[PDB]
């Protein structure tokens, strides 16, 4: 039933795209790379995400499948490549759930600073497990309402920031362009800080690439693709740019209340801080509670999605058969147990601190997302090259790309350099060891090992250009 208005679909997409990067990670990014560097990094990440999502939408429009981009990777490059991509996606979702739990524990502070957050995290995990094991019937309505609330609070924050920056209400001065130029230039640090915050910028924009897959369900994508592309792209870019600009201008970079490895005291989200420092009491608590509820809902939704995708993967012959067993109600049990066991990683805050664990989880999630983006870009490039070699007419494609091969190449190069320049200084110095390399780069060795093992155990090679599936299938 397509009874929902186009505005309703647009706002649902906006709510789904908005995550925890703008709520918490924005302050850390501003404190690390400054306002201008963060703006440039986010603009580049947005352009790359736009190109990748356009290519994915074209791929979905040309040939629709029910196995997502994993099937394309398996059938266009190699089966082991798709297997590794699927396992990396599952691990990325698990790391995202762990990061959501850590963020909930962190934002739980500033109200009761005299009690460890381990108990709160354990209680939240238990509540999520109970909700997942009882039923999952109210998922859609709760998700829609939470997305609406998130959109409302984001637009309220944008409006109040725009009212404050110029200065209309009494009792507060107008900072103007003073917090921007102070000591160091807005562009602070350099190449190292830029590539460091590039991981966070990429993590923030992850999850919005799947909308094109939804656009693959349209009967006539020819006119449906441009409208959705324009609406979603423009709205997301405008909201992100305005929010980041407001946060950077209204908050100095040298703020002790921002997330860092060495923190003098507790850290709070910029959204709460704006109301707290504005002199309006009894108003930051409601926003903090809304943030907590949104984080809890996002974590529950992610856990449900990870359990469902693990069950779907176990349905085929990839995963071992000791996962598809279901109870009398049909709800999987082994997959939920595995998800809980993997998500129990959030208990290391009591032994390694709060900021470091959150940063490591963000880095791991960003690296997994970057690996997935590289895989999908390579698959799209190989598919287009094979179609061109096959001699098929270009007008038969329902959709296409503007600049080729400028799209796939630029995104691939940018992603590769961002991934490689994260910890380049380790090899420069005399100290090499293995602690830093293992701490920073952990998804790449696992991906390489899985791919090598699958190739050795299956004896498979690349797919010839003249021997590939070209004719689309109708479902």
């Amino acid at each position, epitope marked *: 039933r397509r009874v929902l208005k186009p505005r309703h679909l647009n706002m649902i997409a906006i709510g789904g795209s908005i995550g925890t990067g703008l709520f918490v990670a924005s302050g850390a990014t501003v404190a690390t790379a400054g306002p201008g560097g963060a703006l440039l990094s986010y603009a580049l990440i947005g352009l790359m995400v736009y190109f990748l999502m356009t290519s994915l939408g074209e791929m979905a429009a040309y040939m629709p499948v029910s196995g997502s981009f994993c099937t394309y990777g398996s059938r266009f490059v190699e089966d082991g490549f798709g297997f590794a991509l699927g396992w990396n996606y599952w691990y990325n979702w698990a790391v995202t759930i762990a990061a959501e739990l850590v963020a909930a524990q962190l934002v739980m502070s500033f109200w009761f600073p005299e009690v460890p957050g381990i108990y709160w995290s354990a209680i939240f995990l238990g509540i999520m497990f109970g909700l997942n094991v009882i039923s999952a019937r109210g998922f859609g309505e709760s998700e829609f309402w939470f997305a609406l609330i998130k959109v409302v609070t984001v637009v309220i924050f944008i409006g109040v920031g725009l009212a404050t920056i110029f200065g209309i209400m009494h009792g507060v*001065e107008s900072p103007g362009f003073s917090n921007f130029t*102070m000591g160091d230039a807005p562009f602070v640090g350099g190449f190292q800080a830029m590539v460091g915050v590039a991981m966070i910028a990429g993590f923030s924009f992850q999850g919005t690439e799947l909308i094109g897959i939804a656009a693959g369900e349209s009967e006539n994508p020819r006119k449906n693709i441009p409208i959705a592309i324009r609406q979603v792209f423009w709205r997301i870019l405008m909201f992100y740019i305005l929010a980041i600009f407001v946060i950077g201008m209204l908050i100095p970079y*040298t703020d*002790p209340n921002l997330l860092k490895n060495d923190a003098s005291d507790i850290s709070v989200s910029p959204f709460t801080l704006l109301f707290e420092r504005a002199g309006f009491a009894a108003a930051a608590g409601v926003m903090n509670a809304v943030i907590l509820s949104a984080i809890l809902s996002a974590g529950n939704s992610g856990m449900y999605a990870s359990t469902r995708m693990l069950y779907n993967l176990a349905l085929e012959g990839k995963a071992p058969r000791l996962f598809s067993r279901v109870s009398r109600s049909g709800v999987p049990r082994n997959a939920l147990y595995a998800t809980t066991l993997v998500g129990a990683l959030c208990f290391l805050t009591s032994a390694f601190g709060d900021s470091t664990v959150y940063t490591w989880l963000l880095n791991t999630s960003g690296m997994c997302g970057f690996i997935a983006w590289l895989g999908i870009a390579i698959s799209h490039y190989r598919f287009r090259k094979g179609y061109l070699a096959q001699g098929g007419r270009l007008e038969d494609l329902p959709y296409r790309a503007k600049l080729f091969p400028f799209g796939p190449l630029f995104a691939f190069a940018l992603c590769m350099v961002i991934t490689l320049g994260q910890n380049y200084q380790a090899l420069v110095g005399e100290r090499i060891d293995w602690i830093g390399l293992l701490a920073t780069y952990i998804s790449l060795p696992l991906f390489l090992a899985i791919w090598l093992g699958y190739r050795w155990k299956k004896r498979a090679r690349f797919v010839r250009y003249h021997e590939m599936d070209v004719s689309p299938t109708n479902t």
Partner: nanobody
Amino acid sequence: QLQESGGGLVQGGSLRLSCAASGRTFSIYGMAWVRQASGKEREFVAAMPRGGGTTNYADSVKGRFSISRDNAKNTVDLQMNSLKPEDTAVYYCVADRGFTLRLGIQHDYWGQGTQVTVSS
């Protein structure tokens, strides 16, 4: 809310004074030090954000006092050099809340203060 320490009797050398804050302080922007004499109008001395990107002084005391912060005790320190008998007064460590470094002799939060006197 605010505490000051380091005062005493100085013959005219150099001395550092420290100011510390109580809990919360997550709704604040930057601190300042303001002097006043016995039965005299309050006079601004120095101001600085907690993070510390700029410092603001007074015209008559430019180039002689240095205001900074210390992470060992997480306290705002002011070093006074070339102290003179004309500076005998009581200092108040204050702070302001907002988005801009507020100047002037008017502030919201006030402390106990410390009296400094110089002998010949």
